RNA sequence: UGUUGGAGAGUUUGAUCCUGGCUCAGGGUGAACGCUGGCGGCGUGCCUAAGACAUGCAAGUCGUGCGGGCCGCGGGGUUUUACUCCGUGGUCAGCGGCGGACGGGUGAGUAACGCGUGGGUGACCUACCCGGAAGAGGGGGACAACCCGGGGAAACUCGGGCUAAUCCCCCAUGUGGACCCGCCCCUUGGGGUGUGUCCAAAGGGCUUUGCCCGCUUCCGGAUGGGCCCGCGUCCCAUCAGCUAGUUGGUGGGGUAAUGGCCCACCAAGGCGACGACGGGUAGCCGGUCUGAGAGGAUGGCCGGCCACAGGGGCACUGAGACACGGGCCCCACUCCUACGGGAGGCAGCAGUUAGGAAUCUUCCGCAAUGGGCGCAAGCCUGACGGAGCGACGCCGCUUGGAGGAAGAAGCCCUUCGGGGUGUAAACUCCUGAACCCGGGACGAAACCCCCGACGAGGGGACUGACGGUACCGGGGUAAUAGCGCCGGCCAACUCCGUGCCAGCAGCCGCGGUAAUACGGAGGGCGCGAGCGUUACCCGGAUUCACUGGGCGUAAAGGGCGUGUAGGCGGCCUGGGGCGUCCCAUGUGA
C-alpha cells in the first residue's frame, strides 16, 4: 500500500518529520516516492506543516492511505476541505 | 580551559605590548616597562636570527594570545575564513572580533577580554534580550549587546561604564552608556583594527 | 517453544494434499484426453477435453494454478488435440474447439 | 529504446545463428587516447539470409539462448571479407602462442 | 563530487654536483597502549573465532467467520427429581481469514549483469489500497475441537465416531474473462471481433427497507518486483589455453514471463592475448579520508542494491519464500535417553564464554514515528522513542576576574655585583560552576464519543518513556591539570650526576671524565582535559610521472633482422557526419 506517512529526520530530541508517500513496507526512513511536505512537532519556527494540497490530493485519489497522524496534518492544510458554500 | 595563569610573561615573549589585563598594562607595570626582554633564564641573552617558521609562529601566538582562545577554536575560525569569499586575512579578524566575549571588551562593559569572557559566563550580558553565557557566540550585524538587568547594579560593571563616559567606540560599534546597551554595527575592517599583527603571516603559518 | 506458528505448517499440508490432487487430476484428464485424439476417436476426446479444460480453470479458480497457468494448459491441450485430430477427424461435437 | 549496434558477421557455422563483431571506440578513462575494443554478439538468422562477412545492424530482443539476445535488422553492405579476414587472422595467431613450443 | 590553488628538510663527499633510496614535519582513524581525567550536547562503540552459546524477550491478530472444552453470575421448561433450553463474563486450544516473504542481523560467499549507470519487456506477476461495470440463485460433504481406545521413556504418534463456517465441492447464472480457431487494425504472446468450450461467489454486524464490513468476476490507477541488454568493476601470465549441455537448432517439459532453465534428437560449435581458463583478494554503490588537481586509499555508522542465517540439499503453502526466530534428509556439534529414539541453533535486543591490543546495559517505555491484525475498543512490536557504560571522536564549558613591589620565601643559575621562576603567589576587592529551595514544559494530536449526513466542518474527553530531567526564578562556595618536547628537520637552555657505562634513537646520530643529544633540577616552547605512543590510509613521493620522469658513463635500448596482431599515416575536392563540439530535454532519489 502506498501510504502518506511521516518520516524521522531531525536529530535526537529535535524531531522533524516528512509527509512522505510510500510502501508501508519500507521503513518510514528509507527510500520514498515523493515528499508532500513536513511538520516539526516541537513548534519553534513559524512554519510547520507544508503539505502540498495539489500532490497530496492526487496520491489520495490513487489510494495512498494516510496514517491517523498523517491525516490530522493534511486536514490542517486543506487536503480535505472540498469547496462549498450557499447553505452552511 | 585555555591557558589561564601568568600573562605578562606572554606579553614579554612576543616582545610587543599585549592588553590582556585592561588596567595596569597602561601604568608603569606591564613589565614591558623596563624589562621588555622575554622570561626565563635567558630572556636577556642574545637572540639568534629566527627561522621562517619562528616568525610565522611567534606572529600567530600573538594574534591568538590577544584573544586568548585555544589553538583549537583559533584554527577552526581560520578555516571558516579560508573558505569564505574575501581576503582570508581580514575576514579572519572580522570573525575573531565578532566573539561576544570580545565584543563585550570593545563596548567597554569590562576592563579587558578575559574579564569580558567571564562576565559573559556569569550571565551579566545579553544579546537581543535573551542573555548568553557563551564566550564564542558570534555577534551578527544588528544585535544589541546589553548588560544583564540584574547585573547593571554590580559595582564592577558600573565602575567600567562609568569610565567609558567619554571613551569613543570603534566605528563598528556604538553604545548607550545610559541604558548600558550597545550595538554591533558591522564587521570591523582590518583598517578599523589597530593590531600589532601581520596576519599575512599567521596565514602563512597554516600553509605549512 | 510453542510459538503456535506451527498452525501455518498445519494448514499447508491440508492444502498440499488439496492442490496435489486437483492438479494430478488435471494432468491425468489432460493426457488421457490426448491419447484419444492421437488415435482418432473423435468425440470421446473432445468430451474429455471439456472436463479436462474445466478442471483446469477450476483448480485455477483458487490458487492451485491461478494466473495464466490456466492459459498454457488450456491453449496447449487445445492444440495437441485439435492437431492430433489432423488425421481425418472432423470435430463432430467441436466442444472445446471453436471451429 | 533498444540499442542498435553495427558489426561484421564472422561465423555462420550454427543453425539460424550469426556471430557479429561490434567494434566500439572510446577515449581512455585515464589517457584519453582513442581506443578500439570488440565484442562478439550472437544474433538470429531465421531466414539464413545473412552470410559470411555481411555488415549488419543489431537490436536487443527476447533472449533466445545463453548469450543471444540480439537480432539482425537489415543489411548495410552485402560483402566485405576485408575485416572478417582480420579477426580470422587474429585467432590464427593464438593457435601459436605458448605451449606448442615451436622450439621442440 | 565547490568554483581563492601547489612551501620543504635530514641524510652517501676531504669538499661539489647530479642521481637515488631511506627518513621527518601534515591530515584522517569504528582504534588500541601509556600518563593524566572536571561537566554537558550530539555522535559512536567486537575491525579478531560467520567459533560456541545458558535464561529472558525479538510476530502476532480477529468472537462483527465458526463450533466447542472449562471455571463463574443470571433467566426458563417438565408443580419437588434426574434431564434440558436461553442469555452472559473470563478463559484455553481448535477450524478459518490476514500477518509470519515487512521490520531487525551479518558480510561469510560472490570479479558476478552482484552492484553502478542507462535502456528493454509485441516475453511478464503484483495480496492489501484507489476508480469504474456487473453480480452475490440452489444443493451436497469433510476434518478439527470434543468423546472411545491403542502404542510411547520421551518427543509425540495412530486408529475409532459426531459436528460448524467467509473451510471444501457440484449445479445454475455471466456484465464479462480464459483458450482454440477464422478475420481486421498493429506489428516478435499489442488491440478489436465471430460461432464453439471453459470459469464466479459467503457471509458477518448493527441504531434491520438502512448502512457498515466482507465477498465474485473484469477493465484502469497505484506501488512493488522478475527477467533481458550496453556500458563500467582488483591482483598474479612463473595461470594460456577453457568448453560437451558446452554453442546453436526443432519438438516438448517447466515458470507469472524470455531462456539450456530442464530432457529427447540433430548439427558442431562457443569463449580466448581488446586475457578466456586457473589461483589469490573483495559484498557493490550514494558517499568518507587525502590531495592544488589528476589521482590514491577506503566503503564501519546513515541510505539504495546483493548475499547469507550451524555446513549442504530440497521442496510444501502462498501475491510474494525456495522462506534467520517454517518444514524434510545428510553432515558436524552440544543436549535428554529405561540406548528403541528424540532435541536444538543469538550473523534479533540484552547477556555468557573463547579469541583478542579492543568494542557497552541480561535497562525503561510502548507516550511518539512506524508495521502487523481488527468496525472498533485494542493487542503486538528490544522496529523504534529513550536512559546507562566507554574522554572512542567532534563541538561548547570550567578550574576564576581587576589590583597587587624595580620586587617574599624557597628552588636554579651566578669569574659571585647579580639574573631567573614573577605578578606568579601572599594580600585586597569583584563575579560566583558545583551544591540547596520553589517552580517545572515542548515533543500531543488525533483514532473513540456527540452535532453534522456516515461529507466538509465543528464540540468533547483520555493519552507519556525520557523526568521531576532540560529549562526559568532565589540563595550560593574560588571551586580538577596534564602531557609531549626543548642537537639539527622542529619552537625551547643552563647546571649537577654519569663516562661508549646507564641509557637516547623517526633519519642523521648522542655517551669513552666541559655532553645544549643519557638521568634529575631549574628554566623554556607546544597543546590543554587532554597529551604522547603504536598501527594503517593519503600527503610530502614529478619515488610508477595522464596532469608530471626516465635509459652515452648514475637503474634502464631488447645481439641483430624478418614480419604477424596493433598503434601511427603526405596532398586536393566532394558524400557520410562514427569520433568531436554545441543547444534542448529526460535521468543524475
Ligand atoms: Mg523508517
Ligand atoms: Mg581558557
Ligand atoms: Mg611560541
Ligand atoms: Mg580581559
Ligand atoms: Mg511455535
Ligand atoms: Mg499445514
Ligand atoms: Mg492453460
Ligand atoms: Mg571498440
Ligand atoms: Mg544465446
Ligand atoms: Mg559547486
Ligand atoms: Mg661526513
Ligand atoms: Mg462456523
Ligand atoms: Mg475442568
Ligand atoms: Mg413444561
Ligand atoms: Mg488469552
Ligand atoms: Mg482463540
Ligand atoms: Mg528486509
Ligand atoms: Mg536499474
Ligand atoms: Mg487462420
Ligand atoms: Mg507473442
Ligand atoms: Mg601532489
Ligand atoms: Mg535466530
Ligand atoms: Mg500506531
Ligand atoms: Mg481497526
Ligand atoms: Mg564523522
Ligand atoms: Mg556574594
Ligand atoms: Mg604520486
Ligand atoms: Mg627518475
Ligand atoms: Mg589524413
Ligand atoms: Mg555523430
Ligand atoms: Zn602585560
UniProtKB/Swiss-Prot annotation, chain B:
CDD domains xrefs: S4
Cofactor mode of binding and number, as noted: Binds 1 zinc ion per subunit. In a number of structures (e.g. 4Y4O, 5FDV) a 4Fe-4S cluster is seen in place of the zinc cofactor.
Coiled coil: none
One GO location term (cellular component): small ribosomal subunit
Cofactors demanded by this protein: Zn(2+); [4Fe-4S] cluster
GO molecular function, one term: rRNA binding
Keyword vocabulary terms for this entry: Metal-binding, Ribonucleoprotein, Ribosomal protein, RNA-binding, rRNA-binding, Zinc
Domain annotation S4 RNA-binding: ranges: 98-160
Record-listed Zn(2+) binding positions: 8, 11, 25, 30
GO biological process: ribosomal small subunit biogenesis; translation
Cited function: One of the primary rRNA binding proteins, it binds directly to 16S rRNA where it helps nucleate assembly of the body and platform of the 30S subunit. Binds mRNA in the 70S ribosome, positioning it for translation.
Family: Belongs to the universal ribosomal protein uS4 family.
Subunit structure: Part of the 30S ribosomal subunit. Contacts protein S5. The interaction surface between S4 and S5 is involved in control of translational fidelity.
Protein's name in the database: Small ribosomal subunit protein uS4
Source organism of the structure: Thermus thermophilus (strain ATCC 27634 / DSM 579 / HB8)
Lineage: Bacteria, Thermotogati, Deinococcota, Deinococci, Thermales
Curated annotation (Swiss-Prot), chain D:
Gene3D superfamilies from the UniProt entry: Nucleic acid-binding proteins
Keyword check for Ribonucleoprotein: yes
Any one Gene Ontology BP term: translation
Xref: Pfam families: Ribosomal_S17 (PF00366)
CDD domains referenced in this protein's UniProt entry, alphabetically: Ribosomal_uS17
Cross-referenced SUPFAM superfamilies: Nucleic acid-binding proteins
Record's GO cellular component terms: cytosolic small ribosomal subunit
Entry-linked InterPro entries: NA-bd_OB-fold (IPR012340), Ribosomal_uS17 (IPR000266), Ribosomal_uS17_bact/chlr (IPR019984), Ribosomal_uS17_CS (IPR019979)
Keyword terms, alphabetized: Ribonucleoprotein, Ribosomal protein, RNA-binding, rRNA-binding
Gene Ontology molecular-function annotations: rRNA binding; structural constituent of ribosome
PROSITE patterns listed in its UniProt record: RIBOSOMAL_S17 (PS00056)
Subunit and interaction comment: Part of the 30S ribosomal subunit.
Protein function: One of the primary rRNA binding proteins, it binds specifically to the 5'-end of 16S ribosomal RNA.
Homology family: Belongs to the universal ribosomal protein uS17 family.
Name the UniProt record assigns to this protein: Small ribosomal subunit protein uS17
Gene responsible for this protein: rpsQ
Amino acid at each position: 500500500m502506498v501510504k502518506i506517512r511521516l518520516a524521522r529526520f531531525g536529530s535526537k530530541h529535535n524531531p522533524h518529520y516528512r509527509i512522505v508517500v510510500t510502501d508501508a513496507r519500507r521503513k518510514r526512513d528509507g527510500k520514498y516516492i515523493e515528499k508532500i511536505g513536513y511538520y516539526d512537532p516541537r513548534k519553534t519556527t513559524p512554519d510547520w506543516l507544508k503539505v502540498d494540497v495539489e500532490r497530496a490530493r492526487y496520491w489520495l485519489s490513487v489510494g495512498a492511505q494516510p496514517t491517523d497522524t498523517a491525516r490530522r496534518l493534511l486536514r490542517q492544510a486543506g487536503v480535505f476541505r472540498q469547496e462549498a458554500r450557499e447553505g452552511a | 580551559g585555555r591557558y589561564i595563569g601568568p600573562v605578562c610573561r606572554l606579553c614579554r615573549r612576543e616582545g610587543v605590548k599585549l592588553y590582556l589585563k585592561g588596567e595596569r598594562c597602561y601604568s608603569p607595570k606591564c613589565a614591558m616597562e623596563r624589562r621588555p626582554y622575554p622570561p626565563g633564564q635567558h630572556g636577556q641573552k642574545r637572540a639568534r636570527r629566527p627561522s621562517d617558521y619562528a616568525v610565522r609562529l611567534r606572529e600567530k601566538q600573538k594574534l591568538r594570545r590577544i584573544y586568548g582562545i585555544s589553538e583549537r577554536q583559533f584554527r577552526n575560525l581560520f578555516e571558516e575564513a579560508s573558505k569564505k569569499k574575501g581576503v582570508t586575512g581580514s575576514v579572519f579578524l572580522g570573525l575573531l572580533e565578532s566573539r561576544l566575549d570580545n565584543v563585550v571588551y570593545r563596548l567597554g562593559f569590562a576592563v579587558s577580554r578575559r574579564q569580558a569572557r567571564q562576565l559573559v559566563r556569569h550571565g551579566h550580558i545579553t544579546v537581543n534580550g535573551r542573555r548568553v553565557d557563551l564566550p564564542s557566540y558570534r555577534v551578527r550585524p544588528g544585535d544589541e549587546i546589553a548588560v544583564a538587568e540584574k547585573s547593571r547594579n554590580l559595582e564592577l560593571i558600573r565602575q567600567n561604564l562609568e569610565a567609558m563616559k567619554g571613551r569613543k567606540v570603534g566605528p563598528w560599534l556604538s553604545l548607550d552608556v545610559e541604558g548600558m546597551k550597545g550595538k554591533f554595527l558591522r564587521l570591523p575592517d582590518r583598517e578599523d583594527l589597530a593590531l600589532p599583527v601581520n596576519e599575512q603571516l599567521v596565514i602563512e603559518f597554516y600553509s605549512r | 517453544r510453542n510459538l503456535s506458528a506451527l498452525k501455518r505448517h498445519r494448514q499447508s499440508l491440508k492444502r498440499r494434499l488439496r492442490n496435489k490432487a486437483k492438479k494430478s487430476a488435471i494432468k491425468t484428464l489432460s493426457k488421457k484426453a490426448i491419447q484419444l485424439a492421437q488415435e482418432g476417436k473423435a468425440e470421446e476426446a473432445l468430451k474429455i477435453m471439456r472436463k479436462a479444460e474445466s478442471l483446469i480453470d477450476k483448480a485455477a479458480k483458487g490458487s492451485t494454478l491461478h494466473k495464466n497457468a490456466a492459459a498454457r494448459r488450456k491453449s496447449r491441450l487445445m492444440r495437441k488435440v485439435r492437431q492430433l485430430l489432423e488425421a481425418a477427424g472432423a470435430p463432430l461435437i467441436g466442444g472445446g474447439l471453436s471451429a | 529504446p533498444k540499442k542498435v549496434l553495427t558489426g561484421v558477421v564472422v561465423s555462420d557455422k550454427m543453425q539460424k545463428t550469426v556471430t557479429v563483431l561490434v567494434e566500439r571506440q572510446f577515449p581512455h578513462p585515464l589517457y584519453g587516447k582513442v581506443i578500439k575494443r570488440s565484442k562478439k554478439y550472437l544474433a538470429h538468422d531465421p531466414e539464413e539470409r545473412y552470410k559470411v562477412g555481411d555488415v549488419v545492424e543489431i537490436i536487443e530482443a527476447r533472449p533466445i539462448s545463453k548469450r543471444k539476445r540480439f537480432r539482425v535488422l537489415r543489411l548495410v553492405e552485402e560483402g566485405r571479407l576485408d575485416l572478417v579476414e582480420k579477426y580470422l587472422v587474429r585467432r590464427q595467431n593464438y593457435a601459436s602462442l605458448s605451449k606448442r613450443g615451436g622450439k621442440a
